[PDB]
Every structure is written in C-alpha cells, then in structure tokens.
C-alpha cells in the first residue's frame with residue numbers, strides 16, 4: 080500500500096545503516112561484484128539473513144543484482160568509502176540520540192520554554208551536549224568537514240578571494256573550508272573561530288576559542304559564516320549578524336553561505352533543524368531581512384547548486 | 399538528491415509519528431479543513447513550528463492544502479481515528495524499542511546463537527519481553543486485533559465455516575478473528591489458544607493459556623494458525639505444524655492464514671521480521687514444503703488481497 084510503506088519509511092534508513100555502520104559496504108569497493116557466500120565465509124556475516132538485506136538494498140537502488148551477485152549502484156559508490164559524506168550522514172541520521180530526539184518532537188511542539196526536542200531527550204542543547212559525547216562530536220565535525228571540502232571548488236570559482244588579506248571563518252568547525260582555500264589562495268592570514276576545549280593545531284591557521292553570541296573579533300577584511308544561521312532562532316540570528324556589524328569597518332566584507340528554502344526541494348531538513356536546534360531553513364529574502372535588521376546590506380547574491388541541497392552565497396557589508 | 403533523501407527516509411516516519419502519537423491528527427476528523435492558528439489557540443501547539451510540519455505532511459501526501467488550511471488526504475483519513483490499524487502501526491513502528499532493535503540489526507547479522515536484534519537490545523526475545531511491558535503488549539495486541547477485524551469478511555466469503563462444529567484459533571491474540579466469525583457463524587464451540595498470564599473473558603469464547611511449541615489440544619475439527627509462522631525459523635515452523643498433525647484426525651482441518659512473499663511487493667516487512675523475531679516472509683511453495691515435512695497435505699489454496707499485504711489461505715489435512 081502507499082500509506083503502509085510511507086509509515087514504514089524508517090525501514091529503508093535502518094537497512095542502509097545496518098549495511099554501512101557494520102562496514103560490510105566497504106567490501107563493495109571500486110564497483111566490483113561481491114559473492115555473498117564468499118563474503119559470509121570471509122567476514123563471518125550470516126549468508127541467508129544478509130542475502131535478504133541485499134535483496135531489499137537492490138529494491139531501494141543501492142545494490143545492483145547480476146550473476147547471483149551484488150555490486151553498489153553508481154550513485155551509491157560513496158557507501159564503499161566509510162569517510163564519504165553519505166557514510167557519515169547515515170551513521171549520524173540513525174543513532175540512538177537522533178531517534179530519541181525525534182521521539183520528543185511531538186511533545187516539543189507543545190512547550191514554549193525554548194527547549195529543543197534533542198534537549199528534552201538528552202538534558203542539554205545540541206552543541207552543549209556534544210562537549211560530553213565523543214561519538215556524536217567526531218561524526219558531526221567529520222560530516223561538516225566533508226560537505227565543506229565538497230563546496231570549496233564552487234566558492235573559489237564564483238568569488239575573488241585573492242583581493243582580501245585577513246580572513247576569519249566564524250563557526251568554521253575543524254576549519255576544513257579555510258584549510259582548502261589556504262591551499263589555492265596563498266600568503267594570507269587564516270583564522271577559524273569555534274567552541275574549542277582544546278585548540279586544533281594546523282600549519283599557518285589561527286584557531287580561536289570564541290562565542291559568536293558574545294562578539295566577533297575585529298581586524299579581518301573577510302568574514303565567513305557558513306551553515307550556522309539555520310541552527311538558531313530569528314532573534315539569535317540578528318544577534319550574531321549584529322555582532323558582525325560591530326566588528327566590521329566599511330572596507331570589511333561578510334560571506335553568509337547557507338542552505339536555502341527552494342520550494343521544489345524537500346522540507347525534511349527544515350524539520351530536523353527544528354528537532355536538533357529549534358532552527359529552520361530560510362529563503363534568500365528571509366536571510367536579507369535578518370541582515371537588514373542587523374544593519375548589514377547585500378552587495379552580491381549567488382545561488383550555488385550542491386549534490387544534497389541548493390546554497391545561498393550572500394556578500395554583506397555594513398550600511 | 400536521490401541518495402540523500404533515501405538516507406533521510408527516517409524523517410518521513412518520525413514526522414507522521416509526531417502528528418498522530420500527539421493526537422493532533424484526531425482534530426482532522428470527517429475530512430474537515432483545520433485552521434492551524436485556531437488549532438494552536440485551541441490545543442496549545444506552536445503555530446509556526448506545527449505549520450512547518452503541516453507543509454512537510456502535504457509534501458508526503460498525508461495533508462491537503464487549501465485556503466491557507468489543511469485537511470487529511472482521502473487515503474490518510476484513518477490517522478484521524480487513533481484506534482485505526484495505521485495509527486497503531488506508526489505508534490509501534492517508531493518507538494524506542496523498535497529503533498533500539500534496528501540499531502542492533504547490523505551487529506545481529508554476525509551472531510549465530512539465535513539471538514534476535516530485539517533480544518540483543520532488550521535482553522529477552524519479543525513475546526517474552528512483552529510480558530513485562532504494558533505499552534508494547536497493548537499496542538501489539540491492538541494492532542493484530544485491527545488487521546484481524548479487517549480480513550474477516552474476505553475469509554467468511556472464500557471458505558465455508560458452516561460445515562465445522564469445534565473451532566480453535568492457535569496463537570489468536572485477543573481472539574478478535576473468532577469473536578467476529580462467532581457473530582456471523584452461530585451455535586458452534588469457539589476456543590482461542592495464546593500465552594496468557596490472565597485469561598481474557600468473553601461471551602461463549604474458550605480462552606486457553608497454551609504453548610504451540612509443546613502441543614496443540616486435540617478435539618477440534620477446525621484449526622486456524624493466522625500470522626504466526628513468519629515469527630519463527632523453518633525448524634520451529636515444522637515443530638508447530640508437527641504438533642498440529644499429532645492433535646488432528648483424518649476429519650480435522652487446519653487453516654494456515656499468513657502474509658506471503660509476492661515478488662512485486664516490498665521486502666521491508668521481511669527485514670522487520672528478521673529484526674523482531676529472527677522470522678521471515680515465505681512464498682506459498684515454501685509454506686507447503688514446511689507442511690509436507692510436518693506430514694500435512696494441501697487440500698485447497700486461495701490468495702487473499704488486503705490493503706497492506708497479499709495473504710495465503712492454505713487448507714491443510716493429515717497425510
């Protein structure tokens with residue numbers, strides 16, 4: 080049935096997870112065909128029961144069946160690499176923490192005390208909780224690192240980075256975006272601001288233990304705020320963009336990079352942001368209103384298309 | 399993307415759950431259009447955040463948008479009734495117990511000690527665990543009751559129940575199948591065998607605390623075994639069908655009713671049975687092999703089509 084298989088959408092995600100989180104997917108490297116009997120003999124996985132999983136994976140378009148054997152489909156080759164963006168996504172998407180956060184979502188919709196479904200389940204807000212959970216931080220930081228590495232080429236092409244001298248990435252995670260830009264744009268001072276208990280070390284990168292709710296450091300002519308604002312309310316978004324204006328002179332520029340609400344794409348991400356952060360996706364026109372209210376003006380607007388989502392590149396300067 | 403939204407299949411199930419498990423869905427009774435503002439004022443649910451859920455529900459085909467208002471779609475009217483089969487399915491499908499069972503699935507595929515993913519997560523096999531968990535038993539028993547009520551009309555039509563006098567439903571749950579057949583087929587002795595700590599009471603129904611692994615009671619000319627065999631291994635399936643042969647004379651008949659492996663339908667159910675029970679779905683030809691090995695013969699075979707799954711009606715008699 081249409082409705083019964085919709086109610087059983089969860090089974091698709093769980094099947095994928097069982098395949099990759101075990102590391103069975105890593106046996107399907109370079110698009111080669113795997114004999115399940117030989118894999119069972121090699122890995123010690125149960126032939127009969129794993130064969131039934133492989134049949135369900137073929138139905139979902141993840142595996143391709145031929146000569147009583149299975150290979151990963153062309154689009155799903157990424158699952159063969161455990162450090163692929165898709166591999167991290169599935170390990171994070173379906174974990175006890177996310178599931179338990181989703182299970183409070185219903186109850187969260189009736190509370191007005193600004194407590195996220197995640198916080199109701201786990202006792203602290205997302206980032207605060209990740210400070211005490213290694214599994215959850217590494218996989219989150221690793222995921223954001225991978226999506227960062229993927230977008231670099233498309234940024235460097237559309238915008239002139241050569242013009243600036245002092246660049247700060249605000250909430251830049253492990254700093255991967257700048258470390259990639261530092262390789263293709265040379266002889267410039269690079270700084271990454273994020274919440275650190277222990278500073279990341281790197282060759283000529285300036286890692287700052289900071290708080291963008293309190294203040295942004297002045298003395299940079301380029302600022303970047305990538306995939307941050309969707310983790311925050313409209314009010315706290317204006318607070319961060321205000322803290323930018325206070326730190327910037329008329330020469331200085333801010334690159335607001337973020338996933339954007341395109342009507343033709345799915346709202347599933349918008350709901351996850353509500354569950355994890357009490358966040359939300361926003362249209363370009365909504366991002367501008369927050370900037371205008373904070374006293375920043377839009378100089379240049381570019382839409383970037385990525386595998387998983389469309390992005391909004393917005394060049395901001397003080398009014 | 400095709401792969402990223404596949405990895406995020408879980409979000410569809412969770413969104414549905416948040417809508418129904420809260421009982422918000424019950425405000426969409428008789429296909430009427432709901433004003434989210436009025437619902438927020440009435441129920442106390444957050445307008446902004448619930449409106450974003452309603453937009454995602456429209457995308458999934460659960461809600462229909464008109465005049466800045468939402469009604470349940472025709473196929474999803476069932477969600478308005480909290481005692482509908484679909485409402486119970488979603489409450490059971492996505493719960494901590496099922497999610498935690500799914501999270502052991504990967505690790506379960508490497509163990510050979512006959513421990514289900516559910517058992518690895520929860521410490522006992524499914525039915526054994528339900529003895530100590532009210533939430534999980536009621537919702538399970540209620541779900542099986544509803545699917546029982548739905549199939550009655552189609553059974554009574556295809557098979558002559560009027561010919562028999564003493565009928566036993568083996569593993570009949572709350573007994574709902576026979577209680578419905580007792581209303582349309584009259585003046586016959588009705589017995590229901592299942593695992594009971596406290597016997598269900600009912601007007602002229604004979605509830606037996608039994609164990610179909612040990613033995614079936616003799617002295618019945620009709621036996622029914624509906625939706626049981628998919629919760630068990632091939633070996634334990636033969637044991638149950640053997641226990642039938644031992645209890646039956648040449649006059650006696652067994653109705654093996656069960657969901658069947660049709661190649662054109664999804665394998666998601668087959669994987670859930672592996673996770674919950676170390677069970678599996680089987681083709682008619684596979685069900686016959688288990689019966690033939692147990693020393694039973696097929697007299698009459700009927701395929702029944704139901705909303706959620708195709709069924710296999712198999713009339714068995716001793717060889």
Ligand SMILES: C[S@@+](CC[C@H](N)C(=O)[O-])C[C@H]1O[C@@H](n2cnc3c(N)ncnc32)[C@H](O)[C@@H]1O
Nearest residue numbers: 223224227250251252273274289290291305306
């Ligand atoms: C959605 S992630 C984006 C990371 C990075 N832009 C990327 O895409 O690789 C948001 C980041 O903001 C950081 N963050 C959260 N609260 C912060 C705060 N108050 N001050 C500074 N950084 C914060 C988190 O640690 C996280 O690395």
Ligand SMILES: C[S@@+](CC[C@H](N)C(=O)[O-])C[C@H]1O[C@@H](n2cnc3c(N)ncnc32)[C@H](O)[C@@H]1O
Nearest residue numbers: 542543546569570571592593608609610624625
């Ligand atoms: C999948 S449910 C089917 C219930 C019922 N046929 C229906 O569809 O409404 C299987 C039933 O078998 C029962 N059961 C499990 N193990 C049993 C055993 N050893 N002896 C008897 N009944 C058992 C369970 O309690 C459960 O009610």
Ligand SMILES: N[C@@H](Cc1c[nH]c2ccccc12)C(=O)O
Nearest residue numbers: 168171172222348355387402406
């Ligand atoms: N990164 C995934 C979704 C996701 C999972 N966990 C997250 C945490 C933060 C932001 C996004 C996510 C996507 O692109 O769809």
Ligand SMILES: N[C@@H](Cc1c[nH]c2ccccc12)C(=O)O
Nearest residue numbers: 083087487490491541667674706
């Ligand atoms: N009854 C649901 C699936 C389901 C959920 N929990 C179960 C327990 C036992 C058997 C089936 C189920 C269906 O028809 O798809």
